[PDB]
Copies of this chain bind each other. A is one copy, B any other.
Amino acid sequence: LTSSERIDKQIRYILDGISALRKETCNKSNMCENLNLPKMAEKDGCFQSGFNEETCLVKIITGLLEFEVYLEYLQNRFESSEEQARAVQMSTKVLIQFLQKKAKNLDAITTPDPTTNASLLTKLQAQNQWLQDMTTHLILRSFKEFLQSSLRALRQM
C-alpha cells in the first residue's frame, strides 16, 4: 500500500465506524434524516474550483485535530458502544499521523488548547439527554461530511 492508499483506506474505515455509531444513536433518538464544528469552505482549497493541495492538506489536518475533543465527547457518551466510539477516536489519531507524513514538507499545524477542550467537554456533558442526543448526531454528521470531502480532495492530490 502506498502512503496515499493507506490514508484512503483509513478514512473509509473511520466512515464505516461513524456509520455504525450513527445507526445506533439515530435508532434511539430519531433525530436523523452553535457547536462550531470544523467544515470545509471554498477558501480552504479542497474543492475543484480553487483547489490548492497545500492549503487543503493543512485544512484537513487542522480540522481533524479540532474534531478530537468532540470524539472524546462521543467516547464519554456512548455506553454500550463505548468501544466503537473509542476506536473512532484512536483511528482518527492514526489518520492524523499518516497525514503528517504526507505533509512532510509543510509547516507545523496549530493544535487546539487541551484546557479549552476540557471546559467544552464539561459543558457538553452537562446538557440534558435531548440536547446531548442532538450534539451526538450533529458531531457524527459533521465529521462524516468533513471526511467525505477529505477523501474527495485527497484523490485529486
Interfacial chain B residues near A79, Cβ < 8 Å: none
- Docked CA distance A86–B111 (Å): 12
Q: Could you tell me if B114 and A72 are in contact, using CB atoms closer than 8 angstroms? A: yes
Interfacial chain B residues near A97, Cβ < 8 Å: 100, 108-109
Q: A151: CB under 8 A from chain B?
A: no
| Interface footprint category on A | 20 to 34
Count of chain copies:
2
Asked whether A113 and B86 contact (CB < 8 A) given A94-B108, A108-B94, the answer is yes
A contact patch SS: helix
Q: Which of A3, A72, A111, A114 has the most CB of B within 10 A?
A: A114
* A residues 1-55 in Cβ contact with B at 8 Å: 3
Q: Could you tell me if A101 and B100 are in contact, using CB atoms closer than 8 angstroms? A: yes
Q: Could you tell me if B109 and A72 are in contact, using CB atoms closer than 8 angstroms? A: no
Interfacial chain B residues near A98, Cβ < 8 Å: 108
**Smallest CB gap from A104: residue in B:** B101
Q: A76: CB under 8 A from chain B?
A: yes
- Docked CA distance A72–B97 (Å): 21
Write out, one digit per residue, whether chain A residues 72-87 have a CB within 8 A of any chain B CB (1) or not (0): 1001100000000010
Q: A115: CB under 8 A from chain B?
A: yes
Interfacial chain B residues near A104, Cβ < 8 Å: 3, 101, 104
- Chain A positions within 8 Å of B, measured between CB atoms, are 3, 68, 72, 75-76, 86, 89-90, 93-94, 97-98, 100-101, 103-104, 108-109, 111, 113-115, 118
